[model samples]
Target chain A: LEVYTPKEIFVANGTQGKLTCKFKSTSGGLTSVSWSFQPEGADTTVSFFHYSQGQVYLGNYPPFKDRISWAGDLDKKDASINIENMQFIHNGTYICDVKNPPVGKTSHIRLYVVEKE
Target chain B: LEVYTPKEIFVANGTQGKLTCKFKSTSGGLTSVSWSFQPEGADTTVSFFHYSQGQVYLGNYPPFKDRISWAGDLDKKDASINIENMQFIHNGTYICDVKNPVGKTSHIRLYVVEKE
Candidate 1:
């Protein structure tokens, strides 16, 4: 499954935000979804989401552990996710790496946490 | 402008092929489009194809010089490209980095295969 248009998403701060990543490949039967977070002014990115082979691994990285969960249907070819209590720290790019072997893709999720409350 | 779904694309070896990387952002003007190549079994990727600020620059990288051209409209928010005489060596992931400050995206894995 591939993300639709490597699009941008907006979410209010301290609210539930969901990034919808639609897939392009229809060949379903066990796929993988990996996610990485690039915060503002950060020197490096934090990869904290991986789901494949009937196993899900969320890295112990800061600002992402236990804060993200699967919100897409693998069978439906959607690998989206829901961010629990979106924060301003999550206001950068989110790289979604989707794969099903010899085929894979990378989608960028430009997430903005609106603190204008 | 963001690439449409960072999708996998398959093109026949030896021929002209165009990789369509549609954008998402509607707010536009003069933007930037960067491209990188990751060959099969390569440990690292090659950073080439930087187009921004009204300048189009194609890197002098192997298998990519004079073989690539702008295939999308920046005004239309499309950052696509065309590869001429697509060779098997070109069979790899072509990362398209499109951005306009405060926004950057990278798409991957453009597999080039046999002509048959």
Candidate 2:
């Protein structure tokens, strides 16, 4: 098994966008999956999606609360996500880190938000 | 301008390793550069290296002291770092987030193991 994901991603404003990540787990079952966002030129990082302890937590921040959707399943070792109604603020980098208790794997996606208007 | 870095990296114990990141800056110059580490199965993150205001700071966690070096130049927008005498405990992911008030972020998929 192997851990991997797309290195780059392109999404247009007002449309749907997707980010993918995968980490092979032959030692044990996945304990959690997480998504983080770093806006262009921004100093702080914001948590987007977190799945752990059999619970899913979405960032309450205005930009992510109702716009991001879960697209991963621990049973299949997939840690993917989808962004809806993408906007300029969504243009930046997204990191997907997966863990299986004692093992950690990660991958990132560079989101390019194309202007439509 | 754009910010970029290698998505994955691999290092071996008792050896050296390097992580690289670059962010294109046309609006302003870099104000600071920082490195963060997250060990496997760990719920928390730790600071590794930071360069700002013409000074460099390395993690004093014993495992990192005297083992990490700066290999970046603000004039070139390269926020890279080198790890000396890597250890098994060093096997994990690294995040390089560069800031100029605004910021560009990078991630590392690292693996470290002892030599046979």
Candidate 1 reference-contact recovery? 0.00
**lDDT (tens digit, per residue) of candidate 1 on A1-117:** 446734788888999888778877757444667777889778777777665533344554668645788887877888888889888878898888787643458888888888758
Worst 10 residues of 2 chain B by lDDT: B52-61
A1-117 per-residue lDDT for model 2 (tens digits): 456878787777999998888777665343566678889889866765665434444544578756777788777777788889999988888887676644356777888999876
Candidate 1 yields a Cα-based lDDT of: 0.70
Report the alpha-carbon TM-score of model 2 versus the true structure. Answer: 0.47
The alpha-carbon lDDT assigned to residue B11 of candidate 1 equals 77
Check candidate 1 and list the clashing pairs.
Answer: A2-A23, A3-B5, A5-B4, A5-B5, A6-B5
For residues B1-116, what per-residue lDDT tens digits would candidate 1 score against the true structure?
A: 44663568777888887877777775644355666778978866776565543434444476776688777778777787888988888877777767653346666677777878
- All candidates' chain B TM-scores are 0.85, 0.88
